[PDB]
Amino acid sequence: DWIDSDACMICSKKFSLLNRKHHCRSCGGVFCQEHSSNSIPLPDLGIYEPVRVCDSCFEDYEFIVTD
Ligand SMILES: [Zn+2]
Ligand SMILES: [Zn+2]
Numbered sequence: 001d002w003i004d005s006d007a008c009m010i011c012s013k014k015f016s017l018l019n020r021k022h023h024c025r026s027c028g029g030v031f032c033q034e035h036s037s038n039s040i041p042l043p044d045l046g047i048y049e050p051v052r053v054c055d056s057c058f059e060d061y062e063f064i065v066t067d
Contacts, residue, residue, distance in 0.1 A: 001028045008032040010054070026057035 002023050007014045009029045015021040022036050023029070025047070031054045038058040039050035053061070 003028055003030065005030050008035055010035040022052055024054035024057055025051040026053045026061075029054060 008019075008031050010031060011034070013019055013032055015030075015032065019032050022031055022033060024031055024036055025042060025045075026040075036052050036054045038055070039052050040058060040061045041048045041050055042053075
């Protein structure tokens with residue numbers, strides 16, 4: 001499920017203490033803060049409080065909510 005890498009999957013900037021690593025709880029990828037600034041619940045995983053997701057997973061969720 002979760003993978004790891006040394007850089008953001010969207011912008012390829014390398015993580016460091018000044019640009020920390022974060023995982024998307026929906027897709028398992030790694031992203032910088034700028035590309036994972038939103039959080040959403042993941043009911044299909046039994047998670048009902050907002051957890052961090054990447055922009056792509058956030059859009060997917062938002063599309064379902066306002067469909
Ligand atoms: Zn990034
Ligand atoms: Zn994601």
